[PDB]
CSV table of C-alpha atoms in Angstrom, one decimal:
chain,number,residue,atom,x,y,z
A,89,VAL,CA,7.6,-19.2,-33.1
A,90,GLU,CA,9.4,-17.6,-29.6
A,91,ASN,CA,13.2,-19.3,-30.3
A,92,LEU,CA,12.1,-18.1,-33.7
A,93,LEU,CA,11.4,-14.4,-33.0
A,94,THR,CA,15.0,-14.0,-30.5
A,95,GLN,CA,16.7,-15.7,-34.0
A,96,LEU,CA,15.6,-13.0,-36.1
A,97,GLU,CA,16.1,-10.5,-33.9
A,98,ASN,CA,19.6,-11.2,-33.3
A,99,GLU,CA,20.0,-11.9,-37.3
A,100,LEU,CA,18.3,-8.5,-37.4
A,101,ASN,CA,20.2,-6.8,-34.8
A,102,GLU,CA,23.4,-7.7,-36.7
A,103,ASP,CA,22.8,-6.6,-39.6
A,104,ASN,CA,22.8,-3.2,-40.0
A,105,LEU,CA,19.3,-1.4,-38.8
A,106,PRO,CA,16.3,-3.5,-40.8
A,107,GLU,CA,13.4,-0.9,-41.1
A,108,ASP,CA,11.0,-3.9,-39.0
A,109,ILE,CA,13.9,-3.7,-36.3
A,110,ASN,CA,11.4,-1.9,-33.4
A,111,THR,CA,7.9,-4.0,-34.8
A,112,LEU,CA,9.9,-7.2,-34.7
A,113,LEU,CA,11.3,-5.8,-30.8
A,114,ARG,CA,7.3,-4.9,-29.8
A,115,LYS,CA,6.2,-8.8,-30.9
A,116,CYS,CA,9.6,-9.9,-28.9
A,117,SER,CA,8.0,-8.4,-26.1
A,118,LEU,CA,4.7,-9.3,-26.3
A,119,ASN,CA,5.9,-13.4,-27.6
A,120,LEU,CA,7.9,-13.5,-24.3
A,121,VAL,CA,5.4,-11.9,-21.8
A,122,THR,CA,1.6,-14.3,-22.9
A,123,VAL,CA,3.9,-17.5,-23.6
A,124,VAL,CA,6.1,-17.3,-19.5
A,125,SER,CA,9.1,-19.8,-20.2
A,126,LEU,CA,11.8,-19.9,-22.6
A,127,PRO,CA,12.5,-23.1,-24.4
A,128,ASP,CA,16.3,-24.6,-24.6
A,129,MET,CA,18.2,-22.3,-26.9
A,130,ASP,CA,21.3,-20.0,-26.1
A,131,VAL,CA,20.7,-16.2,-24.6
A,132,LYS,CA,23.9,-15.7,-24.5
A,133,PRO,CA,24.6,-14.1,-28.1
A,134,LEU,CA,21.2,-12.1,-28.1
A,135,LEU,CA,21.6,-11.1,-24.9
A,136,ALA,CA,25.8,-10.2,-25.9
A,137,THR,CA,24.2,-8.0,-29.2
A,138,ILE,CA,21.8,-5.9,-27.4
A,139,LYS,CA,24.9,-4.9,-24.6
A,140,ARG,CA,27.0,-3.6,-27.9
A,141,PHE,CA,24.3,-1.6,-28.9
A,142,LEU,CA,23.3,-0.1,-25.1
A,143,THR,CA,27.4,0.5,-24.5
A,144,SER,CA,28.5,1.5,-28.0
A,145,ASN,CA,29.9,4.2,-28.3
A,146,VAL,CA,27.4,5.2,-30.7
A,147,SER,CA,23.8,5.9,-30.8
A,148,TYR,CA,20.6,4.9,-33.7
A,149,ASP,CA,18.1,6.8,-34.9
A,150,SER,CA,16.4,4.1,-36.4
A,151,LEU,CA,16.5,1.9,-33.0
A,152,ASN,CA,13.2,2.1,-29.9
A,153,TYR,CA,15.4,2.4,-27.0
A,154,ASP,CA,12.1,1.4,-24.9
A,155,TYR,CA,11.4,-1.7,-27.0
A,156,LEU,CA,15.1,-2.8,-26.7
A,157,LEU,CA,15.3,-2.2,-22.6
A,158,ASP,CA,11.8,-3.6,-22.6
A,159,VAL,CA,13.0,-7.1,-24.3
A,160,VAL,CA,15.9,-7.1,-21.6
A,161,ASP,CA,13.4,-6.5,-18.8
A,162,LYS,CA,10.9,-9.3,-20.3
A,163,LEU,CA,13.6,-11.9,-21.3
A,164,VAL,CA,16.1,-11.7,-18.3
A,165,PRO,CA,14.2,-13.1,-15.4
A,166,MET,CA,13.0,-15.9,-17.9
A,167,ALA,CA,17.1,-16.9,-19.1
A,168,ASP,CA,19.5,-18.9,-16.5
A,169,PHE,CA,21.2,-16.2,-14.2
A,170,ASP,CA,24.3,-17.8,-15.4
A,171,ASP,CA,24.2,-17.3,-18.5
A,172,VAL,CA,23.5,-13.7,-17.9
A,173,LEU,CA,25.7,-12.9,-15.5
A,174,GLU,CA,28.4,-14.6,-18.5
A,175,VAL,CA,27.2,-11.5,-20.4
A,176,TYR,CA,27.3,-9.1,-17.4
A,177,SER,CA,29.3,-9.6,-14.5
A,178,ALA,CA,29.9,-8.1,-11.0
A,179,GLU,CA,32.1,-5.8,-13.0
A,180,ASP,CA,30.7,-5.3,-16.2
A,181,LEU,CA,27.4,-4.1,-13.9
A,182,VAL,CA,29.4,-2.1,-11.9
A,183,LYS,CA,30.9,0.0,-14.6
A,184,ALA,CA,27.3,0.7,-16.1
A,185,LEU,CA,26.1,1.8,-13.1
A,186,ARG,CA,28.6,4.4,-12.4
A,187,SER,CA,28.3,5.4,-16.8
A,188,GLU,CA,26.7,8.1,-18.2
A,189,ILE,CA,24.4,6.4,-20.5
A,190,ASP,CA,21.2,5.5,-18.6
A,191,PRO,CA,19.6,3.0,-20.7
A,192,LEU,CA,22.4,0.8,-19.8
A,193,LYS,CA,22.2,2.2,-16.2
A,194,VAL,CA,18.1,0.4,-16.8
A,195,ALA,CA,19.5,-2.6,-18.5
A,196,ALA,CA,22.0,-3.3,-15.2
A,197,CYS,CA,19.0,-2.8,-13.0
A,198,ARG,CA,16.8,-5.5,-14.7
A,199,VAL,CA,20.0,-7.7,-14.6
A,200,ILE,CA,20.5,-7.0,-10.5
A,201,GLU,CA,17.2,-7.6,-10.1
A,202,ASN,CA,17.3,-11.1,-10.6
A,203,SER,CA,20.4,-11.6,-8.8
A,204,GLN,CA,20.1,-15.9,-8.4
A,205,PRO,CA,20.8,-15.9,-5.6
A,206,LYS,CA,19.9,-13.0,-4.6
A,207,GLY,CA,22.6,-12.6,-2.5
A,208,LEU,CA,24.8,-12.8,-4.5
A,209,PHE,CA,25.6,-9.0,-5.0
A,210,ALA,CA,25.5,-8.8,-1.3
A,211,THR,CA,29.4,-8.4,-1.3
A,212,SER,CA,30.6,-5.9,-4.3
A,213,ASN,CA,29.4,-2.3,-4.2
A,214,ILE,CA,26.7,-2.4,-6.6
A,215,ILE,CA,24.4,-2.0,-3.6
A,216,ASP,CA,26.6,0.7,-3.0
A,217,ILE,CA,26.0,2.8,-6.0
A,218,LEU,CA,21.9,2.0,-6.7
A,219,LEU,CA,21.4,3.7,-3.4
A,220,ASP,CA,24.7,6.6,-5.0
A,221,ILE,CA,21.8,7.0,-7.8
A,222,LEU,CA,18.8,6.7,-6.2
A,223,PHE,CA,19.3,9.5,-3.8
A,224,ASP,CA,20.6,11.8,-6.1
A,225,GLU,CA,18.2,14.6,-6.7
A,226,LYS,CA,20.1,15.6,-10.2
A,227,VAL,CA,18.7,12.4,-11.2
A,228,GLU,CA,16.3,13.0,-12.9
A,229,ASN,CA,14.6,9.6,-15.3
A,230,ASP,CA,11.7,7.7,-12.8
A,231,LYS,CA,12.7,5.0,-15.2
A,232,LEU,CA,16.0,4.9,-13.6
A,233,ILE,CA,14.6,4.9,-10.6
A,234,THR,CA,12.0,3.6,-10.5
A,235,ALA,CA,14.2,0.4,-12.7
A,236,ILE,CA,16.7,0.8,-9.2
A,237,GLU,CA,13.5,0.8,-6.8
A,238,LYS,CA,12.0,-2.6,-8.0
A,239,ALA,CA,16.0,-4.1,-7.7
A,240,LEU,CA,15.9,-3.4,-4.3
A,241,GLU,CA,12.4,-4.2,-3.7
A,242,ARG,CA,13.3,-7.7,-5.4
A,243,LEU,CA,16.8,-8.5,-3.4
A,244,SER,CA,15.5,-7.3,-0.1
A,245,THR,CA,14.3,-10.7,0.9
A,246,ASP,CA,17.3,-11.7,0.9
A,247,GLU,CA,20.0,-11.0,4.4
A,248,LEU,CA,23.0,-10.9,2.8
A,249,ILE,CA,21.4,-7.8,1.0
A,250,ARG,CA,19.4,-6.2,4.0
A,251,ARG,CA,23.4,-5.7,5.5
A,252,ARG,CA,24.8,-4.2,3.1
A,253,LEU,CA,21.8,-1.9,2.8
A,254,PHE,CA,21.8,-1.0,6.6
A,255,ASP,CA,25.2,-1.8,7.9
A,256,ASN,CA,27.4,-0.5,4.7
A,257,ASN,CA,25.4,2.5,4.1
A,258,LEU,CA,24.3,3.3,7.4
A,259,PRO,CA,25.6,6.4,7.7
A,260,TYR,CA,24.7,7.6,4.2
A,261,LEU,CA,21.1,7.1,4.7
A,262,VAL,CA,21.1,9.0,7.6
A,263,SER,CA,22.6,11.4,6.0
A,264,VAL,CA,19.8,11.9,3.3
A,265,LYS,CA,17.6,11.4,5.4
A,266,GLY,CA,19.4,14.7,7.3
A,267,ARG,CA,18.7,17.1,4.2
A,268,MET,CA,14.6,16.5,4.0
A,269,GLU,CA,15.5,17.8,0.4
A,270,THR,CA,11.8,16.7,-1.3
A,271,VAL,CA,13.1,15.1,-4.0
A,272,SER,CA,16.0,12.8,-2.4
A,273,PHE,CA,14.0,12.6,0.5
A,274,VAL,CA,10.8,10.7,-0.7
A,275,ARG,CA,12.5,8.3,-2.3
A,276,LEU,CA,14.2,7.5,1.0
A,277,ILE,CA,10.3,7.5,2.5
A,278,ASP,CA,9.3,5.0,-0.2
A,279,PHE,CA,12.6,3.0,0.3
A,280,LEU,CA,11.8,2.8,3.9
A,281,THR,CA,8.3,1.8,3.1
A,282,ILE,CA,9.9,-1.0,1.3
A,283,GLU,CA,12.6,-2.3,3.6
A,284,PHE,CA,10.0,-2.6,6.5
A,285,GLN,CA,8.4,-4.9,5.3
A,286,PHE,CA,11.4,-7.4,4.8
A,287,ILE,CA,13.3,-6.1,9.1
A,288,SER,CA,12.9,-8.3,11.9
A,289,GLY,CA,13.7,-6.8,15.4
A,290,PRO,CA,17.1,-7.8,15.4
A,291,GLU,CA,18.2,-5.9,12.3
A,292,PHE,CA,15.9,-2.6,12.4
A,293,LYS,CA,18.0,0.6,13.4
A,294,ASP,CA,15.7,3.8,15.0
A,295,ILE,CA,18.7,6.1,13.7
A,296,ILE,CA,17.0,5.9,10.2
A,297,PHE,CA,13.6,3.8,10.6
A,298,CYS,CA,12.2,6.5,13.1
A,299,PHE,CA,11.7,10.6,13.4
A,300,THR,CA,12.8,12.4,16.7
A,301,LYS,CA,10.5,15.7,17.8
A,302,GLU,CA,12.6,17.8,16.1
A,303,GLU,CA,12.9,16.2,12.9
A,304,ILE,CA,9.6,16.0,12.7
A,305,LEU,CA,8.6,20.2,13.9
A,306,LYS,CA,11.7,20.9,10.7
A,307,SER,CA,9.6,18.4,8.2
A,308,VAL,CA,7.1,21.2,9.1
A,309,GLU,CA,8.7,24.1,7.4
A,310,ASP,CA,8.1,21.7,3.9
A,311,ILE,CA,4.8,21.0,4.0
A,312,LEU,CA,5.3,18.3,1.3
A,313,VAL,CA,8.2,17.4,4.3
A,314,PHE,CA,5.4,16.5,6.4
A,315,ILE,CA,2.9,14.8,4.8
A,316,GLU,CA,5.0,12.9,2.9
A,317,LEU,CA,6.4,11.8,6.8
A,318,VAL,CA,2.7,11.8,8.0
A,319,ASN,CA,2.1,8.6,5.1
A,320,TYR,CA,5.3,7.1,6.3
A,321,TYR,CA,3.8,6.8,9.7
A,322,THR,CA,0.4,6.0,8.4
A,323,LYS,CA,1.4,3.1,6.7
A,324,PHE,CA,4.3,2.6,9.5
A,325,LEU,CA,2.2,1.5,11.6
A,326,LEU,CA,-0.7,-0.4,9.0
A,327,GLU,CA,2.6,-2.3,8.1
A,328,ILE,CA,2.6,-3.5,12.0
A,329,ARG,CA,-1.1,-3.9,12.0
A,330,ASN,CA,-1.2,-6.0,9.1
A,331,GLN,CA,2.2,-8.1,9.8
A,332,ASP,CA,2.2,-8.2,13.2
A,333,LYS,CA,5.5,-6.2,13.5
A,334,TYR,CA,4.4,-5.1,17.6
A,335,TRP,CA,7.9,-5.4,18.7
A,336,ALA,CA,8.5,-1.9,16.1
A,337,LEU,CA,5.5,0.0,18.5
A,338,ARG,CA,8.3,0.9,21.5
A,339,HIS,CA,10.1,2.4,19.1
A,340,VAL,CA,7.8,4.5,17.5
A,341,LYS,CA,4.7,5.6,19.6
A,342,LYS,CA,7.3,7.8,21.4
A,343,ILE,CA,6.6,10.9,19.0
A,344,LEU,CA,2.8,9.6,17.6
A,345,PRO,CA,1.4,12.8,20.6
A,346,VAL,CA,3.8,15.3,18.4
A,347,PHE,CA,1.1,15.2,15.1
A,348,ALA,CA,-2.0,15.4,17.5
A,349,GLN,CA,0.1,18.7,19.0
A,350,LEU,CA,0.2,20.2,15.2
A,351,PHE,CA,-2.7,19.6,14.2
A,352,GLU,CA,-4.0,20.9,17.3
A,353,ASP,CA,-1.5,24.4,17.1
A,354,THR,CA,-3.7,25.5,14.1
A,355,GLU,CA,-2.1,29.3,14.4
A,356,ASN,CA,1.7,28.7,15.2
A,357,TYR,CA,1.4,25.8,12.4
A,358,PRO,CA,-1.0,26.8,9.9
A,359,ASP,CA,-0.3,25.0,6.8
A,360,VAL,CA,-0.5,21.7,9.2
A,361,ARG,CA,-4.5,22.2,9.2
A,362,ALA,CA,-4.9,23.9,6.1
A,363,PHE,CA,-2.8,20.7,4.0
A,364,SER,CA,-2.8,17.8,6.0
A,365,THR,CA,-5.8,17.3,7.3
A,366,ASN,CA,-7.1,14.9,5.7
A,367,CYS,CA,-3.6,12.6,6.2
A,368,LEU,CA,-3.6,13.1,9.9
A,369,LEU,CA,-6.9,12.4,10.5
A,370,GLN,CA,-6.1,8.8,8.2
A,371,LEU,CA,-2.8,8.6,10.9
A,372,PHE,CA,-5.2,9.1,14.2
A,373,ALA,CA,-6.7,6.4,12.8
A,374,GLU,CA,-4.6,3.5,13.3
A,375,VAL,CA,-3.1,5.1,16.6
A,376,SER,CA,-6.4,4.4,18.0
A,377,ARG,CA,-5.6,0.5,17.2
A,378,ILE,CA,-1.9,0.4,18.1
A,379,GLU,CA,-1.2,-2.8,20.1
A,380,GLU,CA,-1.6,-0.8,23.6
A,381,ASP,CA,-2.9,-0.6,26.7
A,382,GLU,CA,-6.4,0.7,27.2
A,383,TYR,CA,-5.8,3.8,25.1
A,384,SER,CA,-2.9,4.8,27.3
A,385,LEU,CA,-1.2,6.5,24.9
A,386,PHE,CA,-4.2,7.8,22.9
A,387,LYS,CA,-6.8,8.6,25.4
A,388,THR,CA,-3.9,11.7,25.7
A,389,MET,CA,-3.9,13.2,22.5
A,390,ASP,CA,-6.7,13.2,22.4
A,391,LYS,CA,-7.0,15.5,25.4
A,392,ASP,CA,-4.9,17.5,25.4
A,393,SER,CA,-4.9,17.5,21.3
A,394,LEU,CA,-7.5,15.9,18.8
A,395,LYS,CA,-10.3,16.9,21.3
A,396,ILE,CA,-12.5,14.8,19.5
A,397,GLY,CA,-16.6,16.8,19.8
A,398,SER,CA,-15.1,20.0,20.2
A,399,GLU,CA,-14.9,20.4,16.6
A,400,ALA,CA,-17.9,19.9,14.7
A,401,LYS,CA,-16.9,19.6,11.5
A,402,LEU,CA,-14.7,17.1,12.4
A,403,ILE,CA,-17.0,14.8,13.7
A,404,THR,CA,-18.5,12.6,11.0
A,405,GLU,CA,-14.9,12.3,10.0
A,406,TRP,CA,-13.5,11.3,13.6
A,407,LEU,CA,-16.0,8.7,14.1
A,408,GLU,CA,-15.7,7.2,10.5
A,409,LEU,CA,-12.0,6.6,11.5
A,410,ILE,CA,-11.6,6.2,14.8
A,411,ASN,CA,-11.5,2.6,16.8
A,412,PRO,CA,-15.1,2.4,17.9
A,413,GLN,CA,-14.5,1.4,21.2
A,414,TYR,CA,-11.9,4.0,22.2
A,415,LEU,CA,-15.5,6.2,20.4
A,416,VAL,CA,-17.6,4.8,23.1
A,417,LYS,CA,-15.6,4.8,26.3
A,418,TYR,CA,-14.9,8.6,25.5
A,419,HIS,CA,-17.8,9.9,23.8
A,420,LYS,CA,-21.0,7.7,24.0
A,421,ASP,CA,-21.8,10.8,24.9
A,422,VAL,CA,-21.1,12.2,21.2
A,423,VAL,CA,-21.9,8.9,19.4
A,424,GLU,CA,-25.3,9.0,21.0
A,425,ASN,CA,-26.4,12.2,19.6
A,426,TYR,CA,-24.7,12.7,17.0
A,427,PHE,CA,-24.8,9.3,15.2
A,428,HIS,CA,-28.5,9.1,12.8
A,429,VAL,CA,-28.9,6.7,10.1
A,430,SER,CA,-28.9,8.4,6.3
A,431,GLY,CA,-27.1,7.1,3.1
A,432,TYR,CA,-25.2,9.7,4.3
A,433,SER,CA,-24.1,7.9,7.3
A,434,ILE,CA,-23.5,4.6,6.1
A,435,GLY,CA,-19.7,4.9,6.2
A,436,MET,CA,-20.2,6.3,10.4
A,437,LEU,CA,-22.4,2.9,10.5
A,438,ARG,CA,-19.7,0.8,9.2
A,439,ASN,CA,-17.1,2.1,12.1
A,440,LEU,CA,-19.4,2.3,15.1
A,441,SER,CA,-20.6,-1.1,14.2
A,442,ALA,CA,-17.6,-3.3,14.8
A,443,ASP,CA,-17.9,-2.6,18.2
A,444,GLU,CA,-20.9,-4.7,20.0
A,445,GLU,CA,-20.5,-1.3,23.4
A,446,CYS,CA,-20.3,1.1,20.2
A,447,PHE,CA,-23.1,-0.2,18.4
A,448,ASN,CA,-25.6,-0.5,21.2
A,449,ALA,CA,-24.8,3.6,21.6
A,450,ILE,CA,-26.7,3.9,18.3
A,451,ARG,CA,-28.8,1.0,18.5
A,452,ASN,CA,-32.1,3.0,19.5
A,453,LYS,CA,-31.6,5.0,16.4
A,454,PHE,CA,-32.6,1.8,14.0
A,455,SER,CA,-36.6,1.1,13.7
A,456,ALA,CA,-37.4,-0.3,10.2
A,457,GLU,CA,-39.6,2.4,9.1
A,458,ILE,CA,-36.6,4.8,8.6
A,459,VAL,CA,-34.4,2.3,6.9
A,460,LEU,CA,-37.0,1.1,4.6
A,461,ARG,CA,-37.7,4.6,3.4
A,462,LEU,CA,-33.6,4.4,1.9
A,463,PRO,CA,-33.7,3.7,-1.7
A,464,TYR,CA,-33.3,-0.6,-2.0
A,465,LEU,CA,-28.6,0.3,-2.8
A,466,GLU,CA,-28.5,2.5,0.8
A,467,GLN,CA,-30.9,-0.7,2.4
A,468,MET,CA,-28.5,-3.0,1.1
A,469,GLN,CA,-25.8,-1.5,2.2
A,470,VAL,CA,-27.4,-0.3,5.9
A,471,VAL,CA,-28.8,-4.5,5.9
A,472,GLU,CA,-24.9,-5.9,5.0
A,473,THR,CA,-23.2,-4.1,7.8
A,474,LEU,CA,-26.0,-5.5,10.5
A,475,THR,CA,-25.1,-9.2,9.2
A,476,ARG,CA,-20.8,-8.6,10.3
A,477,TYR,CA,-21.4,-9.2,13.1
A,478,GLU,CA,-22.8,-11.1,15.8
A,479,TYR,CA,-24.9,-8.4,18.0
A,480,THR,CA,-25.9,-6.6,14.7
A,481,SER,CA,-27.7,-9.8,12.9
A,482,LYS,CA,-29.1,-10.3,16.3
A,483,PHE,CA,-30.8,-7.2,16.6
A,484,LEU,CA,-32.1,-7.3,12.3
A,485,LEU,CA,-33.1,-10.4,12.9
A,486,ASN,CA,-35.4,-10.0,16.7
A,487,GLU,CA,-36.0,-6.1,15.9
A,488,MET,CA,-36.4,-5.5,12.8
A,489,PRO,CA,-38.2,-8.6,10.9
A,490,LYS,CA,-39.8,-6.1,8.6
A,491,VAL,CA,-36.3,-4.6,6.7
A,492,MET,CA,-35.6,-9.0,6.4
A,493,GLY,CA,-38.2,-9.5,4.4
A,494,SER,CA,-37.4,-5.8,2.1
A,495,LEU,CA,-33.8,-8.2,2.0
A,496,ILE,CA,-35.6,-11.1,0.7
A,497,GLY,CA,-37.9,-9.4,-1.6
A,498,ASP,CA,-40.4,-9.4,-3.7
A,499,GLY,CA,-39.4,-11.5,-6.3
A,500,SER,CA,-37.3,-8.7,-8.7
A,501,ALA,CA,-34.4,-9.2,-7.3
A,502,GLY,CA,-32.6,-11.2,-10.9
A,503,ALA,CA,-32.9,-8.3,-12.5
A,504,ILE,CA,-31.1,-6.2,-10.2
A,505,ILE,CA,-28.5,-4.6,-12.3
A,506,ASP,CA,-26.7,-2.0,-10.1
A,507,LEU,CA,-23.0,-3.4,-9.1
A,508,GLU,CA,-23.5,-2.4,-5.7
A,509,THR,CA,-26.5,-3.0,-4.9
A,510,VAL,CA,-25.7,-7.2,-6.2
A,511,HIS,CA,-22.3,-7.0,-4.2
A,512,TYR,CA,-24.0,-5.7,-0.6
A,513,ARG,CA,-27.6,-8.2,-0.9
A,514,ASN,CA,-25.5,-11.2,-2.1
A,515,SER,CA,-22.9,-10.7,0.4
A,516,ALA,CA,-25.3,-9.9,3.2
A,517,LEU,CA,-27.3,-13.2,2.5
A,518,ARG,CA,-23.9,-15.0,2.4
A,519,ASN,CA,-23.5,-13.4,5.9
A,520,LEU,CA,-26.5,-14.6,7.7
A,521,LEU,CA,-26.6,-17.6,5.8
A,522,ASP,CA,-22.5,-18.0,7.7
A,523,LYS,CA,-24.8,-18.4,11.1
A,524,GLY,CA,-26.5,-20.7,10.0
A,525,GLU,CA,-30.5,-22.4,10.5
A,526,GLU,CA,-30.9,-22.7,13.9
A,527,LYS,CA,-29.8,-18.6,14.3
A,528,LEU,CA,-31.9,-17.8,11.0
A,529,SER,CA,-35.2,-19.7,11.9
A,530,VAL,CA,-38.1,-18.7,9.5
A,531,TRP,CA,-35.4,-16.6,8.1
A,532,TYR,CA,-33.4,-19.9,6.9
A,533,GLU,CA,-35.2,-21.4,3.3
A,534,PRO,CA,-36.0,-18.2,1.7
A,535,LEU,CA,-32.4,-16.5,2.7
A,536,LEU,CA,-31.4,-20.2,1.0
A,537,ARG,CA,-33.6,-20.0,-1.6
A,538,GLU,CA,-32.8,-16.0,-2.5
A,539,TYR,CA,-29.5,-17.0,-2.6
A,540,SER,CA,-29.4,-19.7,-4.7
A,541,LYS,CA,-31.2,-17.9,-7.4
A,542,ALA,CA,-29.0,-14.6,-7.0
A,543,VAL,CA,-26.3,-16.8,-7.5
A,544,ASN,CA,-27.5,-19.0,-9.5
A,545,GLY,CA,-28.9,-17.0,-11.7
């Protein structure tokens, strides 16, 4: 099929355009995907033929260029790059990127994206030009912006590509960072987020990855930029925490209290609380979990600015988001009094129960009676949460056997069609079973039985 479709396509493209040309292109695309590997053919003529149409002095009304590019998009990664290179040389690509033809530029991006070796173009100005286009606010083609970003993420696993980006183009990158112009700025933030995944300690440059107190204060002038910056930093901390790049913390942590100061200062920066409250909350959640010594930094941001507990409307959010160890050590009074069990407080329960000391602060709010008054879906959400930890499991088993009996149920569980009820019940059962028969005493056999019924039907 494939060798055949592509052959037919190279033929058609080289007559005067047949009426089914776009139907053939669509079919080529679907087949290229489903099948994954190409046969033993020469893709050069077709690649060269398509290049002629893209670079062509002439535009064809009878041709769907989106469909044409999609064939290129699927076909290039499947071909041997040495063959693609023969049709699109480093020099052809430069020309294509400096052209006035967006579809041609997108094709060039696809080629560059699939470079082999990835460092192949690192010694030309191709990367420089891609950045020139990427941070041009006048460039409005969304397909091209995404094509560039896709090529850059693909190649940036390579160290030589990263050098070309952050060495050869550092001054330009810093100048883009300085404009804080909405369009180019969001692109720059997305670019940095992607690049930080690949950056090593020795490669890391503060001047481009980090913002000073002054830059942050300036970003508030336009709340969209500020919000983009908050989200940048939340993802930044998340990536650090996910990929264990703790070396990066010393570079970023010093400006974190500026976000908390802006959050507090409602009269001098009303836009911050009006439009940026939820993303700042997500940032502070990450800050409460950074690798630092005993909340040194976070405790001060809380004492000076966040003032967890002082604003009643935010208490549920704080107790849903902030490190529970921090919460019980500095706001035990709030934890002990604010929290009560209900469907509504499941978010808090999930967070507060993830530290043993913090869970002990809410434990007296639990009784079999309160839990058994919840509909079964919310019971299972509560029970599932309690099965996640040793200390909460032990509480469930020794103090709430009637809740355990509800988990085991009246024999109608197989009948349940509610997605989440089944998800949480099964997770609870499995979690408890993972503790092993000796910790489960008399619950072991019923749990094994209900689990088997659940998974085997």
